Design a protein around this ligand. Sequence first.
Ligand code: HEM
Ligand code: HEM
Ligand SMILES: O=[N+]([O-])c1cccc2c(Br)n[nH]c12
Ligand SMILES: O=[N+]([O-])c1cccc2c(Br)n[nH]c12
Ligand SMILES: [Cl-]
Ligand SMILES: [Cl-]
Lengths: 362, 362
Amino acid sequence: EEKEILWNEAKAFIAACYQELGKAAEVKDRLADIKSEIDLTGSYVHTKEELEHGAKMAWRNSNRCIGRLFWNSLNVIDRRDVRTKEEVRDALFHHIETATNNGKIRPTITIFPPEEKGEKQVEIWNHQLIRYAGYESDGERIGDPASCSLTAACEELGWRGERTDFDLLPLIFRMKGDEQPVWYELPRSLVIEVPITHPDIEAFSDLELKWYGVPIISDMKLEVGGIHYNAAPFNGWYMGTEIGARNLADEKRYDKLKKVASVIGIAADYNTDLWKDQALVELNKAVLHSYKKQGVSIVDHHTAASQFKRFEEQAEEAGRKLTGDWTWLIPPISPAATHIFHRSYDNSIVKPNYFYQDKPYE
Amino acid sequence: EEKEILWNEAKAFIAACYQELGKAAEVKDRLADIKSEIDLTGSYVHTKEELEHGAKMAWRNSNRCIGRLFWNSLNVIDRRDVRTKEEVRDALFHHIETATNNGKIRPTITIFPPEEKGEKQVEIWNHQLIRYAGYESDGERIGDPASCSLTAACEELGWRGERTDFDLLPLIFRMKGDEQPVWYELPRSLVIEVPITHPDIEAFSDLELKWYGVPIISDMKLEVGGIHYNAAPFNGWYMGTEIGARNLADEKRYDKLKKVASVIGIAADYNTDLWKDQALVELNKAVLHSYKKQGVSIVDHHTAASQFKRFEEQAEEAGRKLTGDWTWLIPPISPAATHIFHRSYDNSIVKPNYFYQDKPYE
Ligand code: HEM
Ligand code: HEM
Ligand SMILES: O=[N+]([O-])c1cccc2c(Br)n[nH]c12
Ligand SMILES: O=[N+]([O-])c1cccc2c(Br)n[nH]c12
Ligand SMILES: [Cl-]
Ligand SMILES: [Cl-]
């Protein structure tokens, strides 16, 4: 059964991947080979080409991603060789550096060894590689609530944050055979960060907001032809709204709108003033401007959605069915000003793809 | 079969309605009575109490309505007696007047005679009772595009708009047995309208925006215990965002954002300025302010969503399952600033309810 699901995912996967790559004749033989390898080993190993392209497909089938126009240019780094924690840490450091590229961000994915009998070789605990600690000590909230549980896990283990609102979490992961993960402080030279300033309103700096340059999702599994790469951290660049509208705005995260409001000189007393809407727009403007001012790559949600419309034309022109989760594609501000809003999307799962998995802390 | 679906909807309906009204013992007998009436007539007639409460339930089960907190106070007007077009017109005029209430708007529904063998007694063509004409004469767009097809139907029939951007459409409906509908010009004394002005920016009047006070959906069917009231126009008051974010903003409707932008003294050249977001917020502010300034009832989307949260607590406290279409509940601006956004809703159909039906023009 295990063999059988694996075998089928593999057949589907190879046929489609080789078809896309104009390598259709080579399929019979490659499958034969795989049929033997799974017969013998109970698994099979991807070629470099298969793995690069699988990862590309997985991004392309990510229903919740608006920035899939650029799926085919994903930078794929194949680290299936790593056996030691030093190599993992160092692969992680490298990915941060190469993806950041001095602020001209490259969409990158580092792929570590797959699961064996569903036995993990590496288990990355961070949610993102770069992320801020969250504390809560008797109703004194500090930093990022979303990170509270992970943060108290690190602290268990030895780490100690400075309790700033933007403490950098360390990398923390576990190796097959170890009962505990290790952690390693993030070198600061690696992490680009941006202060938030407004183009017009100088008192805006008084807020002392900043955010990190690159979002690198480090806790989703990549599945490709029945192979489960549980550790395969990936990145793009940010759409502004995720910083300015979620991370900084949500009540459960940084909860900045009142302060935004106060410092932009509007009152926060009456819903009918639309002071949250208005703050949200100045804050999202502050975000794009600061990242563009710093030479760090970013997209606004309007631009992003025009990109995603090209993606839609291109799927269909390529004869590919489109999938999409409307609830995630629409941006959290001015969604009706994007075409995404006015159409519907088929939310089926096509593999290859990225998937959630259980957190090991909690 | 017809009898059978009708009979079952009826059983479900009566049991639930009488249960809610503490009239559970009276059910056996009322059903017996109905069983006879459908045996004989092929249909059955609602009591005043059943009909009032059915209409209330239908609003309560309207998954796409954020303003369901007020379902139980719906004003129900029972016009199952009307036989003539003069009575229909006059029922319509009355509803406009009584629902408007000098701007203190009363949620009201006028219920005309049901379908017979699915044969309509009255067929209302308007989408809303109060709505603006749309023209398009060789790439000269006038008024409201959404109304283009209806408008050319009236014009067929004799009506002639002044070709302003806010021409009032006439009432137009058809009576069983007539091959054509009639139309009747809307008396102007009946229709409250609001000019849009900004609280701060006086040049805002230069835009010469206005909108009508009361939205009255006149082309959906109400179903109650298997009875199909195809003509049962209903109203609430407006959430600002529907005017300020859809009606006035969408490209396919009035398409005002550039102009908004120009008159609020920001440039409309770069997506990264968030000039659509910013215009949308000043325009939605202009809308609430003008309606509150005029003594016309309106709700902002934040207030609305806090109301809808009480509705959610109240369903559950009453032991009722909640339903909801997330895609409609979220507002089209600052949706992530409402709790609606951060939860999910079950989109099943529970009857009684309001439903779409085929347009007769087009
Ligand atoms: C190049 C720039 C990129 C942009 C601007 C972008 C934008 C986004 C945004 C805005 C979301 C919504 C997520 C949220 O609301 O938290 C998202 C989700 C996602 N994106 Fe992308 N993305 C990019 C690159 C990538 C890459 C490189 C991959 C994979 C290789 C990817 C896979 C996904 C996935 C799987 C999700 C859903 C994640 C989840 O469940 O939380 N995207 N994307
Ligand atoms: C009292 C104030 C009311 C407010 C503020 C309100 C608000 C809304 C809003 C904002 C929508 C979204 C529709 C759109 O995006 O076009 C909506 C939909 C709807 N509401 Fe309400 N509503 C109210 C009263 C009513 C009443 C009285 C009824 C029925 C008796 C009702 C039934 C519905 C239905 C059926 C829909 C979906 C209509 C469609 O498919 O286009 N609501 N409501
Ligand atoms: O840009 N975003 O707001 C955003 C959200 C979630 C995941 C990603 C990645 Br991987 N690149 N950008 C992202
Ligand atoms: O207020 N709204 O934006 C809105 C939208 C659609 C239907 C209705 C009614 Br009936 N009252 N208010 C409505
Ligand atoms: Cl993020
Ligand atoms: Cl409307």
